[PDB]
Write a protein that binds this ligand. Structure first.
Ligand SMILES: CCCCCCCCCCC(=O)OC[C@H](COP(=O)(O)OC[C@H](O)COP(=O)(O)OC[C@@H](COC(=O)CC)OC(=O)CCC)OC(=O)CCCCCCCC
Ligand SMILES: CCCCCCCCCCC(=O)OC[C@H](COP(=O)(O)OC[C@H](O)COP(=O)(O)OC[C@@H](COC(=O)CC)OC(=O)CCC)OC(=O)CCCCCCCC
Ligand SMILES: CCCCCCCCCCCCCCCCCC(=O)OC[C@H](COP(=O)(O)OCCN)OC(=O)CCCCCCCCCCCCC
Ligand code: HEM
Ligand code: HEM
Ligand code: HEM
Ligand code: HEM
Ligand code: HEM
Ligand SMILES: CCCCCCCCCCCCCCC(=O)O[C@H](COC(=O)CCCCCCCCCCCC)COP(=O)(O)O
Ligand SMILES: CCCCCCCCCCCCCCC(=O)O[C@H](COC(=O)CCCCCCCCCCCC)COP(=O)(O)O
Ligand SMILES: CCCCCCCCCCCCCCCCCC(=O)O[C@H](COC(=O)CCCCCC)COP(=O)(O)OCCN
Ligand SMILES: CCCCCCCCCCCCCCCCCC(=O)O[C@H](COC(=O)CCCCCC)COP(=O)(O)OCCN
Ligand SMILES: C/C=C(C)/C=C/C=C/[C@H](OC)[C@@H](C)[C@@H](OC)[C@@H](C)CCc1oc2c(O)c(OC)cc(OC)c2c(=O)c1C
Ligand SMILES: C/C=C(C)/C=C/C=C/[C@H](OC)[C@@H](C)[C@@H](OC)[C@@H](C)CCc1oc2c(O)c(OC)cc(OC)c2c(=O)c1C
Lengths: 248, 93, 57, 385, 126, 385, 93
C-alpha cells in the first residue's frame, strides 16, 4: 500500500492525559466544548453525550441547565393530541444539526459528517490523529495530485482526499478565560473534549487502576513467598539408595 | 459400585508404580528452615538455566523467522515506493 | 516483618479469619483515602475542582 | 473416613482438588488449565451481568453496549474485563495447547483428553465469534457476513444453509438476535465439555516434564498445587488489570467503535488477533472452497498428532531435533498471524503460502520423520552392535 | 509408536556397515549428550513411555534388583527436575552405564505379541 | 469388560440408565422423575429457539412475543409448548413430591436427595416467575411488582433490596431486561441441581411401594424401565399436545394478552394456577411481614418431614390413619388453590385460614402424632402378655 | 480411585441384601407366551378390585372437602345477593 493510501503517520504530541497517572486537563475540556459548539456543531452531532454528564466535569449544573434550555425537544402531546415542544433539560442528549442523514448529506456535498461522540476511539491514532487532521490542511495539494471538485487535501487522511475542509483559523473563537485562540490551541482543546466524550470514565478508570495494580502486585509477590514456604519441605527433600539384599 | 476399566494410575496405597525398596527419603519442616532469606544472589548462578541451555533452540528459529519477516517487509516497502513502481508492475501483474 | 513484633500481637498463631476480615475493612478505607489524595495531588490544576476555583460565571 | 471423602458431593471435590495425586515435578506450564477455568468463570459472570443491560435488536445493540460503557455503574469495567478477558482466554489456551504439544500430552493414554480439548477449542472460537457480532460495530457486521458465508462453500446446499443462519437476505436483525441467544448458550456447553475434559484427565492423571511415569512420587493437590496455582492466578489478574484499566482498547479494532453499515465494508477491516493465523491460511489458497476446507483442516489436523508422533518417549525435553522444530512451528504460527494482519501484497502472499505449508508439514511430515530419526539416534548412540 | 523391533533393525543395519557407522554414530553420540538425560541420573531405557501392554510385560519381567534401581533413578530424577538443577557431575550416568537393560525384555515381548497376532489371523491353504 | 462399562463417558450412562439395579416392584408413580427431566429439556429447547426472536426491552417485549405467535414459522407451537409445558412441569412436580410424601421417600437414607429436591422446587418456581414477567402483559407487570415487593418486608434494608432488584423507581426497562437474562440462567442452575439430585439418588437407589429393602430382587433399568418410562413419556406428550393444539390458553390468564400498564392493576388479577395455594397462604395472614414469612415457611416446612415422621416403617402403604390424612392433605392443598382463585370475601377468608393451619398441622402435628399412634397399634395388635 | 462411604445398596454380585438359599425361581420367555390377550377377564376384575380397597381413603377426604367448598360457595353467593345484604353487612365488619 502506498504512503498516500495509508495516510501520513500522526506524530506523538505530549497530551497531558497520556500516562497511567494522568487525568484529563478539565480547563481544556471546557474550552474544547466551546470549539465544538461554535465550530464543529454546525455539521457534527454528539448524540451519545447527555447534558448531565458535563456537570462537574467542564461546567456547573447552572451553566449546563442554561445550555440545555437553548434547544427545543419534543414533549408529550397536549390533551388534544397536538404535538408540542419544550426546552431541553439535563436528562436530554446534546442535539445534532441535522434532522436526518439525507439533510446532512445535502448540506455537505453528498458527504456525511460522522457523529463525534466516539471519534477518538474509532480512529487509529486517537488524539494524535484528530489533532493532526485538524491542523494538517496545506494551502495547496502536492504537485500532481488530482483532487475531485468539492474535495480537500489532507495528508493525514487515508487517500489524502477528504470531504471536510479546514475549519480552524486563528481567533475564530474568543475563549472565556483569555487563552489565545490559535488554530493549534483550538485543535488541542476540541480533541481533549472529544477524548472525554469518548471515554468519560477516563479519570476514574485510571484511579481505580492504580488501586487494582498495587493490590494485585502485592498479592502476586505474597503468593510467591507463601508458595515457597509450603514447598520448602519437598524442595529440600533428600533421597538415598541402598541396594536391597537379593531375597524375595 | 459398577466395575470400572483399568488405567495406568491408581490412588494412595496402590498408585500403580513398581514395588519400592532400598530408597530412604529425609525432609525437614518448612518452619525449621531459613525464612527464604536467600532468593537472589544465591539463586542467580543457577538462574538462566532455561536460557544458557535452552536459548539456542528458541533463538535460532526466532532469528530465522524475524529476519525472514524483516526481509519481506523491507521489500514490500520498496515495491510501493516511487522507486519500486517498475518492479511492482512486474511482480504484481 | 519482625518476629517479636508479630509475636506481641498474635504469638505463635496465624491470624484468624475474624481479624483478617476486620483488617480488610480498615484497609479498604485507609487505602482508598491515601490513593485518592495522592492521585488528586498528582493532577493538581487539571481537576474540575481546581478549574472551578478560578473559572466562574 | 473423613467427611470430605464420605459425603457424596465433597468426595468429588476431594478427588479432583484436594487429594488428587499430582506428579511432584510438574512445572508452571501445568498451571494454564486452572487459568482457563478462571477465564471461563470471568467471561460467564461478566457476560451475565452485562446481559442485564443489553438489547440484541440490530438497531439497539451498538447503543446498548455504549449504555453499558456510559450509564451502567462499573459498566466499563465489566465490558473491558469481558473483551480483554476473551483475548487472554485465547492466549492462555494457545499456551495450554503448546504445552501439550511440547510434552507429548496428546499421546496415549490421553488421546481422548486431547480430542475433547480440540472440541473445546472450536467451541471457544465459535463463542468468541458470536460475542463479537453482538457489539454490532463495523467489524461485527462484516465478520458475521464473512464467517456465515464460509458455509456457502458446501456444495448444493451451501447457500440455503447461509440463508438459514441469517434468518433473511443478509446479516440483519434476526441474525444478531439469534447470535446473542447462541452466545449465551455455548459457554454452558463449553462448561459441560470442560467437565468431560476433567473426567478424561482424572483417570490417568497429569503427565510431567520428564515424560515418564509419575506413579513413584506423587504429592497431594491441596496446598502444594492449590497455592502454586494461586501464584499464576494473581499474575494473570495483574496483567489483565493492566490492560483493563490502562490499555483497554489495545487488543481491539477501532472500526468496531463505528456502528455496523450493511453498505460499506471498511478498507481497514482486520479479524480479531487470535483468528489471524487461520485467516492467513484461508487467504493463502486462491480458491473459495479449498481455502475454507484448508482453514478448518488447520484445526482438525491437531487430531493426527497421536498417530504421527512415532517416538518411543513422550515429550520433547530430551530431543534436540524435536525441540528445534517445535519452536520453528511456534514462530511459524506467529508469522502466520503477522501475515494475516498485512494486506494481500507481494511478498506477503508467498510468505503466507510457505508458512501455511510449514504449518501442515509439521504434523504430517516433520514430526513423523524427525521422531523416527531420533528413535534410531537413541539406539545407535549407545548400543555396540 | 515405532516398534523397538523396527528401531533395532534399522540401527543394527547402520552399526554393521563400516561406512554408515562411522558416519552416524558420532552424530548419535552428540545427540545423546545434548539430550541431557544422563545429567538427571537417567539411562535411556528409563525414558521409554511405559503406558502400553508391551512395556508393562517388560517391566514385570525385569529382575527385582534392577527394578529397584530403576525406581530410584526415576524418583531421583523427578526430585532434581523440580529443584531446577542437574545432579552433581559424579552422579551423572556414565556412557558405559547407559546400557539397554530393558530392551531385550521389550524385544522378547514384541516378538511374542507379533506371533500371536499372526497366529490369530492365519489363513489355511487347502 | 464391555465398552459401555470401560469407557469413561459411557460408564456413567451405563450406571445411571442401563445397568442401574431397580427394585422390581416400583410402580408408575416412579415414572414422574423421568417426566421432569423431559419437561426441563422441553422448556430449555423451546426457550432457546424463542429467545432468538425475543426482545427484552420493556417497550418491545410484549410485541416480540406477538411476533413469535404471528411471524415466526411454528412460533405459536414453540410458545404454546413453552407456556403449557411450564404448567405441566408443575403438575408433574406436584405428583413427584406427593409420591415422595406418600411412600416416605424423604426418610433416611434419602434426606439429602429430598433436600436437594426442595431447592430445585424453589428454583423452578423462581424460573417460572421470571419467564412470566418476560411476556410483559398485565399479569406480568403486577406479578413482577408484587413478588419483588415481597423483599420489602425484610426489616431495615427491605426497600433498598427492592430498588436494587428493580434497577429503578419501579418495575421498568432495567427490570424486564435483567429478568430475561436471569430467566435464561436459572434453568442451567436447575440442570446442575438435577445432576446433584441424581447423584444422591444413585448411592442408595430408589425406594419402592412396599417401603422395605429392594436389595433382594433387582432388575436392570435397561429395557424394563426404559420401556416403562416410554409409556408415560407418550401419555405426557399426548396430553400436552391436546392442550397445545386444542386448548392452548385454558391454563393461562386473558389479562396477559393486555400490555403491562404501570398505572392500572386489573380487578381480575390472579396468580398463575400453580402458585395459588401459596398465594392463599400469604393472603390468610392479615399482616405484611408474617404473611410473607408464612408463605416461604410453607415451602421450607417440607424440610421437617424426615424428623417429624416418627414411624418405624417407611411409607403409607400399610398405614390406615396415615393414608387417610395424606389425602386430607392433598385435597386441602387443592382447596387452598381454589381459595386463592377467589376474592377476599366471607366465608373464603376463614376457610383459607383454616386450610392454612391444616397445611402446617400436617407436618408439625398430624404426622408425628399419627405415626406414633400407629407404631403402638402395630405393636399391641399382635404381641400379647 | 479414592475410598468412598458405604451405603445400603451395592451393585450386581454384591447388592447388600441377606444371603439367599432355598428359593427357586422359574420364568418363561415372553416369545413363548400368548400375545398379550389375557388382558380382559384377567385384569378387568382385578381392576376396580384394587380401587375398591383404596377408594374410601381417597373419596371420604374428597367428600369432606367438596362439601366444605360447596357450602362456603353457596353461602358466598347468598351474601352477595339482594336477600343477603343484611347478613353481609353484619359479618363483613
Ligand atoms: C497475557 C496472558 C498470560 C498472563 C498470565 C500468564 C502467567 C503464567 C504464564 C507463564 C508460564 O507459565 O511460564 C512458565 C515458565 C516455567 O517456569 P518453571 O516451572 O520451569 O519455573 C521454575 C521457577 O524458577 C520455580 O520457582 P518458584 O516457584 O520458587 O517461583 C517461581 C516464580 C514463578 O513466577 C510465576 O509467577 C510463574 C512464571 O516466581 C518468581 O520467583 C518470579 C519473581 C517475579 O516460567 C518461566 O520461566 C517463563 C518463561 C517465559 C515464556 C513466557 C511466554 C509467554 C508468551
Ligand atoms: C395429568 C397431567 C400431566 C400428564 C402426565 C401424565 C403422566 C401419567 C401420570 C399418572 C400416574 O402416574 O398414575 C400412576 C398410577 C399407578 O399405576 P400402577 O403402577 O399402580 O399400575 C398398575 C397397572 O395396571 C400396570 O399395568 P401395565 O403396565 O401393564 O399398563 C398400565 C397402564 C399404564 O398406563 C399409564 O401409562 C398410566 C395411567 O396402561 C394401561 O393399561 C392403560 C390403558 C389405556 O396409574 C394408575 O393406575 C392410575 C390410578 C389413578 C391415578 C390418577 C392420576 C391423578 C391425576
Ligand atoms: C491451533 C494450533 C495452536 C498452536 C499455537 C502455538 C502456540 C502459539 C504461541 C503460544 C505462546 C507460548 C508458546 C508456548 C511454548 C512453551 C511450551 C513449553 O511447554 O515449553 C517448555 C520449554 C522448556 O521446558 P524444559 O522442561 O524442556 O526445560 C528444561 C528443564 N530441564 O519452555 C521453553 O523452552 C521456554 C519458553 C519460551 C517461549 C517462547 C514463546 C514465544 C511466543 C511469542 C508470543 C506471541 C507474540 C505476539
Ligand atoms: C473543529 C470542529 C470539527 C471537528 C473536531 C471535526 C472533526 C472531524 C473528524 C475527526 C472527521 C472524521 C474524519 C475521518 O473519517 O477520519 C470529520 C469528518 C468530516 N467533517 Fe468535520 N470536524 C469539525 C468541523 C466540521 C465542520 C464545521 C463541517 C461542515 C462544514 C465538517 C464536515 C465534515 C465532513 C463532511 C466530514 C467527512 C469527511 C470524509 O469522510 O471525507 N466538519 N470531521
Ligand atoms: C476452557 C478450556 C480448557 C480448560 C478449562 C482446560 C483445563 C485443563 C486442566 C485443569 C488441565 C490440568 C492441568 C494442566 O495441564 O494445565 C488440563 C490438561 C490438559 N488439557 Fe486442557 N483445558 C482446556 C482446553 C484444552 C485444549 C484446547 C486442549 C487441546 C487441544 C487441551 C488439552 C489438554 C491436555 C492434553 C492436558 C494434559 C496435559 C498433561 O498433563 O500433560 N485442553 N486442561
Ligand atoms: C467462554 C465465554 C465467552 C467468551 C469467549 C465471550 C466472548 C465475547 C467477545 C469476544 C465479545 C466481544 C467483546 C467486545 O469486543 O466488546 C463478547 C461480547 C458480549 N458477551 Fe461474551 N463471551 C463469553 C460468554 C458470555 C456469556 C455467558 C454471556 C452471557 C450472556 C455473554 C454476554 C456478552 C455480551 C452481553 C456481550 C456484549 C457486550 C460487549 O461487547 O462486551 N458472554 N463476548
Ligand atoms: C427438575 C425436577 C426434578 C427432577 C428432574 C427429578 C428427577 C428424579 C428422578 C429421575 C428420580 C427417580 C425416579 C422417580 O422416583 O421418579 C427422582 C427421585 C426422587 N426425587 Fe426427584 N426430581 C425433581 C424434583 C424433585 C423434587 C421437587 C423433590 C422433592 C421436593 C424430589 C424428590 C425426590 C425423591 C425423594 C426421590 C426418591 C423417590 C423414591 O425412590 O422413593 N425430586 N427424582
Ligand atoms: C426451567 C425451565 C423453564 C421454565 C420453568 C420456564 C417458564 C416460562 C414461563 C412460565 C414463561 C411464560 C410463558 C407464557 O405465559 O407465555 C416463559 C416465557 C419465556 N421463556 Fe421460559 N422457562 C424455562 C426455561 C427457559 C429458557 C432456558 C429460556 C431461554 C432463554 C427461556 C425463554 C423464554 C422466553 C423467550 C419466554 C417468552 C416467550 C413466551 O412467553 O413464551 N425459558 N418461560
Ligand atoms: C475456577 C477458578 C480456578 C482457579 C484455581 C485456583 C486455586 C486457588 C484457590 C485458593 C484456595 C486456597 C485455600 C487454602 C485453604 O483453605 O487453606 C487453609 C488456610 O487458608 C488460609 O490461610 C487463607 C489463604 C488465603 C488465600 C486467598 C484466596 C484467594 C482468592 C483468589 C482465588 C480466585 C480463584 C488451611 O490452612 P492450614 O493448612 O495451615 O491449617
Ligand atoms: C430426558 C429424559 C426423558 C426421557 C425418559 C425416557 C427414556 C426413553 C428412551 C427410549 C430409548 C429406547 C431405546 C431402545 C433401544 O435402544 O433398544 C434397542 C431396540 O430398539 C428398538 O427396537 C427401537 C424402539 C423405538 C424407540 C422409540 C424412541 C422413543 C421416542 C423418544 C421419546 C423421548 C423423547 C435394542 O433392542 P434388542 O434388545 O431387541 O436387541
Ligand atoms: C455438574 C454439576 C456439578 C457436579 C456435582 C458434584 C460437585 C459438587 C460440588 C459442590 C460443593 C458443595 C457441597 C456442599 C454439600 C455437602 C454437605 C452435604 O451434602 O450435607 C448432606 C445434606 O445436604 C443437604 O441436606 C443439602 C445439600 C445441598 C448442597 C447445595 C450446594 C449430608 O449428607 P451426608 O453425607 O452427611 O449423608 C449421611 C451419610 N451417613
Ligand atoms: C453437564 C454435562 C456434563 C458432562 C457429564 C459427562 C456425561 C457423559 C455423557 C456423554 C455420552 C457421550 C459419550 C460418547 C463418547 C464415548 C466414546 C469415547 O469416549 O471414545 C473414546 C475417544 O473419544 C474421542 O476421541 C472423543 C470423545 C468425544 C465425545 C463428545 C460427546 C475412546 O476412549 P477409550 O475408552 O477407548 O480409551 C482410549 C484408550 N486410551
Ligand atoms: C451460529 C454459529 C456459527 C455460524 C459459528 C460459526 C463458526 C465458525 C468458525 O469457528 C468455529 C470460525 C469463526 C473460525 O473458522 C475456523 C475462524 C477461524 C474464522 C476466521 C476468520 O475470521 C474473520 C473475521 O473474524 C473477520 O472479522 C472482521 C473478517 C474476516 O474476513 C475478512 C475473517 C475471515 O476471513 C476468517 C477466515
Ligand atoms: C430476581 C428474582 C427474584 C426476585 C425471584 C423471586 C422469587 C420469589 C418466589 O419464588 C421462589 C415467589 C415467585 C414464590 O414465593 C415463594 C411464589 C409462590 C409467589 C406467589 C405469588 O404470586 C403472585 C403472582 O404470580 C401474581 O401474578 C399476577 C400476583 C400476586 O399477587 C397479587 C402474587 C402473590 O401475591 C404471590 C404470593
Amino acid at each position: 500500500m502506498t504512503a498516500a493510501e495509508h495516510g501520513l503517520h500522526a506524530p506523538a504530541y505530549a497530551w497531558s492525559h497520556n500516562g497511567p497517572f494522568e487525568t484529563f486537563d478539565h480547563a481544556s475540556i471546557r474550552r474544547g466544548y466551546q470549539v465544538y459548539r461554535e465550530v464543529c456543531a454546525a455539521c457534527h452531532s454528539l448524540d451519545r453525550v447527555a447534558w448531565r454528564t458535563l456537570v462537574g466535569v467542564s461546567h456547573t449544573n447552572e451553566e449546563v441547565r442554561n445550555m440545555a434550555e437553548e434547544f427545543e425537544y419534543d414533549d408529550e402531546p397536549d390533551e388534544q393530541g397536538n404535538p408540542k415542544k419544550r426546552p431541553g433539560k439535563l436528562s436530554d442528549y446534546i442535539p445534532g444539526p441535522y434532522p436526518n442523514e439525507q439533510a446532512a448529506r445535502a448540506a455537505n456535498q453528498g458527504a456525511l459528517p460522522p457523529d463525534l461522540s466516539l471519534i477518538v476511539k474509532a480512529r487509529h491514532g486517537g488524539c494524535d490523529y484528530i489533532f493532526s487532521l485538524l491542523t494538517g490542511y496545506p494551502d495547496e495539494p502536492p504537485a500532481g495530485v488530482a483532487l475531485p471538485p468539492g474535495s480537500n487535501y489532507n495528508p493525514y487522511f487515508p487517500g489524502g482526499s477528504i470531504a471536510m475542509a479546514r475549519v480552524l483559523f486563528d481567533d475564530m473563537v474568543e475563549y472565556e478565560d483569555g487563552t489565545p485562540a490559535t488554530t493549534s490551541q483550538m485543535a488541542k482543546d476540541v480533541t481533549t473534549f472529544l477524548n472525554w466524550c469518548a471515554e468519560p470514565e477516563h479519570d476514574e478508570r485510571k484511579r481505580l487502576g492504580l488501586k487494582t495494580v498495587i493490590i494485585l502486585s502485592s498479592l502476586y509477590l505474597l503468593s510467591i513467598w507463601v508458595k515457597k514456604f509450603k514447598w520448602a519441605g519437598i524442595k529440600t527433600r533428600k533421597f538415598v539408595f541402598n541396594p536391597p539384599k537379593p531375597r524375595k | 459400585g459398577p466395575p470400572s476399566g483399568k488405567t495406568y494410575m491408581g490412588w494412595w496405597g496402590h498408585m500403580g508404580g513398581p514395588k519400592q525398596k532400598g530408597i530412604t527419603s529425609y525432609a525437614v519442616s518448612p518452619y525449621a528452615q531459613k525464612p527464604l532469606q536467600g532468593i537472589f544472589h544465591n539463586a542467580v548462578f543457577n538462574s538462566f538455566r532455561r536460557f544458557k541451555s535452552q536459548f539456542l533452540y528458541v533463538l535460532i528459529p526466532a532469528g530465522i523467522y524475524w529476519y525472514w519477516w524483516k526481509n519481506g517487509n523491507e521489500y514490500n516497502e520498496f515495491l510501493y515506493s516511487k522507486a519500486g513502481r517498475e518492479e511492482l508492475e512486474r511482480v504484481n501483474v | 516483618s519482625f518476629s517479636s513484633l508479630y509475636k506481641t500481637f498474635f504469638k505463635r498463631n496465624a491470624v484468624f479469619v475474624g481479624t483478617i476480615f476486620a483488617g480488610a475493612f480498615v484497609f479498604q478505607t485507609v487505602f482508598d483515602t491515601a490513593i485518592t489524595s495522592w492521585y488528586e495531588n498528582h493532577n493538581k490544576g487539571k481537576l474540575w475542582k481546581d478549574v472551578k476555583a478560578r473559572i466562574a460565571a | 473416613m473423613a467427611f470430605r471423602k464420605s459425603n457424596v458431593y465433597l468426595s468429588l471435590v476431594n478427588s479432583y482438588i484436594i487429594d488428587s495425586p499430582q506428579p511432584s515435578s510438574i512445572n508452571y506450564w501445568w498451571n494454564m488449565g486452572s487459568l482457563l477455568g478462571l477465564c471461563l468463570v470471568i467471561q460467564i459472570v461478566t457476560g451475565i451481568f452485562m446481559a442485564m443491560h443489553y438489547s440484541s435488536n440490530i438497531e439497539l445493540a451498538f447503543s446498548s453496549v455504549e449504555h453499558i460503557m456510559r450509564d451502567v455503574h462499573n459498566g466499563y469495567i465489566l465490558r473491558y474485563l469481558h473483551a480483554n478477558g476473551a483475548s487472554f482466554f485465547f492466549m492462555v489456551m494457545f499456551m495450554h495447547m503448546a504445552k501439550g504439544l511440547y510434552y507429548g500430552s496428546y499421546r496415549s493414554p490421553r488421546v481422548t483428553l486431547w480430542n475433547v480439548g480440540v472440541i473445546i477449542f472450536i467451541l471457544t472460537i465459535a463463542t468468541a465469534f458470536l460475542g463479537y457480532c453482538c457489539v454490532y460495530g463495523q467489524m461485527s457486521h462484516w465478520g458475521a457476513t464473512v464467517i456465515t458465508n464460509l458455509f456457502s462453500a458446501i456444495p448444493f446446499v451451501g447457500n440455503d444453509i447461509v440463508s438459514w443462519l441469517w434468518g433473511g437476505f443478509s446479516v440483519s436483525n434476526p441474525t444478531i438476535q439469534r447470535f446473542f441467544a447462541l452466545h449465551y448458550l455455548v459457554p454452558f456447553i463449553i462448561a459441560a465439555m470442560v467437565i468431560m475434559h476433567l473426567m478424561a484427565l482424572h483417570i490417568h492423571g497429569s503427565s510431567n516434564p520428564l515424560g515418564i511415569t509419575g506413579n513413584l512420587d506423587r504429592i497431594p493437590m491441596h496446598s502444594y498445587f492449590i497455592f502454586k496455582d494461586l501464584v499464576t492466578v494473581f499474575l494473570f489478574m495483574l496483567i489483565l488489570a493492566l490492560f483493563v484499566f490502562y490499555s483497554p482498547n489495545t487488543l481491539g479494532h477501532p472500526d468496531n467503535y463505528i456502528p455496523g453499515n450493511p453498505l460499506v465494508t471498511p478498507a481497514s477491516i482486520v479479524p480479531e488477533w487470535y483468528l489471524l493465523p487461520f485467516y492467513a491460511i484461508l487467504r493463502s489458497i486462491p480458491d473459495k472452497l479449498l481455502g475454507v476446507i484448508t482453514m478448518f483442516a488447520a484445526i482438525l489436523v491437531l487430531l493426527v498428532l497421536p498417530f504421527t508422533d512415532r517416538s518411543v518417549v513422550r515429550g520433547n525435553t530430551f530431543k534436540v531435533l524435536s525441540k528445534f522444530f517445535f519452536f520453528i512451528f511456534v514462530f511459524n504460527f506467529v508469522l502466520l498471524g503477522q501475515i494475516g494482519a498485512c494486506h494481500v501484497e507481494v511478498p506477503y502472499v508467498l510468505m503466507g503460502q510457505i508458512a501455511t505449508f510449514i504449518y501442515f508439514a509439521y504434523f504430517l511430515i516433520i514430526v513423523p520423520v524427525i521422531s523416527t530419526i531420533e528413535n534410531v539416534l537413541f539406539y545407535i548412540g549407545r548400543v555396540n552392535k | 509408536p515405532q516398534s523397538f523391533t523396527s528401531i533395532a533393525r534399522i540401527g543394527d543395519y547402520i552399526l554393521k556397515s563400516p561406512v554408515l557407522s562411522k558416519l552416524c554414530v558420532p552424530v548419535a553420540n552428540q545427540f545423546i549428550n545434548l539430550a541431557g538425560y544422563k545429567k538427571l541420573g537417567l539411562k535411556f531405557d528409563d525414558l521409554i513411555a511405559e503406558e502400553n501392554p508391551i512395556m508393562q510385560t517388560a517391566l514385570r519381567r525385569l529382575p527385582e534388583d534392577e527394578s529397584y534401581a530403576r525406581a530410584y533413578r526415576i524418583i531421583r530424577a523427578h526430585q532434581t527436575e523440580l529443584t531446577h538443577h542437574l545432579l552433581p557431575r559424579n552422579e551423572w550416568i556414565k556412557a558405559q552405564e547407559d546400557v539397554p537393560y530393558l530392551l531385550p525384555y521389550i524385544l522378547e515381548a514384541e516378538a511374542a505379541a507379533k506371533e500371536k497376532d499372526e497366529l490369530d489371523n492365519i489363513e489355511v491353504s487347502k
